Amino acid sequence: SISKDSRIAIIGAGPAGLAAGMYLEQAGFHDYTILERTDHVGGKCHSPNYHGRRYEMGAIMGVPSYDTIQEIMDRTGDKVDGPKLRREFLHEDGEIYVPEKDPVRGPQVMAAVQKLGQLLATKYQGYDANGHYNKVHEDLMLPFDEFLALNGCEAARDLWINPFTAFGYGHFDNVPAAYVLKYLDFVTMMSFAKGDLWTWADGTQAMFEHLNATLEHPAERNVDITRITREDGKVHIHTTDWDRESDVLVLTVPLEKFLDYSDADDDEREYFSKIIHQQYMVDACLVKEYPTISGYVPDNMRPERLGHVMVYYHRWADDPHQIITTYLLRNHPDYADKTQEECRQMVLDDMETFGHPVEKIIEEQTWYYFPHVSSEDYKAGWYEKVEGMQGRRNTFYAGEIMSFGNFDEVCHYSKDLVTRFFV
Numbered sequence: 001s002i003s004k005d006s007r008i009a010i011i012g013a014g015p016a017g018l019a020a021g022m023y024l025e026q027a028g029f030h031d032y033t034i035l036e037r038t039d040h041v042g043g044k045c046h047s048p049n050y051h052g053r054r055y056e057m058g059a060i061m062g063v064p065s066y067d068t069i070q071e072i073m074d075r076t077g078d079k080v081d082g083p084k085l086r087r088e089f090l091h092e093d094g095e096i097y098v099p100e101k102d103p104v105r106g107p108q109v110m111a112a113v114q115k116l117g118q119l120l121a122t123k124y125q126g127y128d129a130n131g132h133y134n135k136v137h138e139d140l141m142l143p144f145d146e147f148l149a150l151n152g153c154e155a156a157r158d159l160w161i162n163p164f165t166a167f168g169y170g171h172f173d174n175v176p177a178a179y180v181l182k183y184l185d186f187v188t189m190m191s192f193a194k195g196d197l198w199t200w201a202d203g204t205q206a207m208f209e210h211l212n213a214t215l216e217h218p219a220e221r222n223v224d225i226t227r228i229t230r231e232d233g234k235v236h237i238h239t240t241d242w243d244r245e246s247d248v249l250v251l252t253v254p255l256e257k258f259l260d261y262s263d264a265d266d267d268e269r270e271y272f273s274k275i276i277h278q279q280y281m282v283d284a285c286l287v288k289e290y291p292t293i294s295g296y297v298p299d300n301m302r303p304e305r306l307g308h309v310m311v312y313y314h315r316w317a318d319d320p321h322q323i324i325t326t327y328l329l330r331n332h333p334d335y336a337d338k339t340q341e342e343c344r345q346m347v348l349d350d351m352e353t354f355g356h357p358v359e360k361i362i363e364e365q366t367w368y369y370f371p372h373v374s375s376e377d378y379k380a381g382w383y384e385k386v387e388g389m390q391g392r393r394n395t396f397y398a399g400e401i402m403s404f405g406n407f408d409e410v411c412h413y414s415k416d417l418v419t420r421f422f423v
């Protein structure tokens with residue numbers, strides 16, 4: 001479909017762009033370049049150093065069905081070798097509870113989970129295909145909570161919420177089921193429930209730094225792209241230090257932000273303007289009365305508790321002076337955005353309520369997170385349109401918006417992008 005001698009410009013050296021280069025290269029496309037704006041690779045897989053070890057400012061974990069990430073690891077020599085994950089559940093007052101042994105609610109949840117599994121196995125068979133170019137059932141276009149209510153499966157939300165809302169992906173009242181069930185597909189949900197999770201001692205970033213190194217063309221970094229245009233069957237890229245012509249453009253960067261430095265056409269502008277994102281804030285903390293385990297707080301995952309700590313990550317069990325990361329959301333469609341200052345204050349108060357008071361915040365990051373569209377826009381055929389635009393003026397669209405904000409999903413999509421359009 002596309003000629004091996006094409007000059008291919010990939011924008012972004014996150015998992016998505018690095019994967020694009022890997023699978024292009026392995027398909028015989030040797031003239032790609034990856035353009036990265038920062039000084040580093042891995043994107044939201046970001047594993048900085050502290051006291052001889054690496055902590056996670058972004059992604060922490062995978063599941064055994066992360067087949068594409070296994071291929072990446074087959075290529076780099078990396079191994080799943082991080083510390084074990086364990087967790088407790090806390091109420092918003094900090095008291096420990098065991099929802100798995102709630103004799104009334106527990107059965108209700110697992111019964112709903114059983115029923116949903118059967119629906120997914122029959123009625124919604126195909127729901128978990130990567131990307132959204134296979135048009136899902138209309139039901140999956142509804143907010144997850146409405147999708148569950150339609151099917152009499154409300155109580156299932158209790159299991160699904162913890163690795164979703166706490167993981168920054170937003171709230172079940174508004175986020176379409178399509179996203180939730182592609183990420184937390186039945187088998188993936190089961191792996192999470194069971195604690196069968198991948199972590200890396202050197203961070204999730206490490207395998208991406210290593211992938212980049214294995215590439216024929218490691219990413220070019222500190223590349224400040226000021227403008228892109230696509231006249232006359234060609235791509236023209238202008239950066240502070242140069243400007244070059246390519247034959248093919250691959251975007252793994254945010255598509256609404258792309259509008260501000262490109263000759264974006266009417267469709268691009270109209271549709272990329274609909275993209276909404278999460279403001280997901282992570283605080284790298286030194287604390288007293290070091291936790292003995294990670295904690296989730298479902299009470300603080302309610303929209304009424306927006307900006308509160310939903311979860312904190314106990315990474316290094318042996319060293320009580322190592323980093324504990326905290327996680328909170330600053331936005332919700334039906335609420336005013338929470339300010340950084342006020343959310344930072346909640347980090348301190350909540351961690352104190354939890355009995356693990358903060359001595360120091362050494363790093364803090366609000367991420368551009370989980371780009372997506374509303375149920376209304378999804379229903380109106382957003383992905384039909386954008387997937388119909390694939391290749392228009394030699395521009396291909398990828399990254400988080402085109403699949404899901406998880407590093408296996410975006411890598412998987414980049415791989416299939418090669419199969420779908422290039423080979």
Ligand SMILES: Cc1cc2nc3c(=O)[nH]c(=O)nc-3n(C[C@H](O)[C@H](O)[C@H](O)COP(=O)(O)OP(=O)(O)OC[C@H]3O[C@@H](n4cnc5c(N)ncnc54)[C@H](O)[C@@H]3O)c2cc1C
Nearest residue numbers: 012013014015016037043044058059061399400405406407
């Ligand atoms: C706190 C947190 C927890 C997470 N937990 C998990 C998890 O448990 N499991 C999981 O699978 N995933 C997890 N993720 C999500 C995962 O990290 C991302 O979905 C993944 O990194 C997406 O890869 P990407 O390449 O599409 O986007 P990104 O990682 O965001 O990378 C995009 C790249 O493009 C670059 N870029 C942006 N603009 C430009 C520009 N204008 N010009 C050039 N380059 C540009 C960026 O600098 C970046 O390198 C987590 C993320 C965070 C923040």
Ligand code: NA
Nearest residue numbers: 099100159193
């Ligand atoms: Na459970």
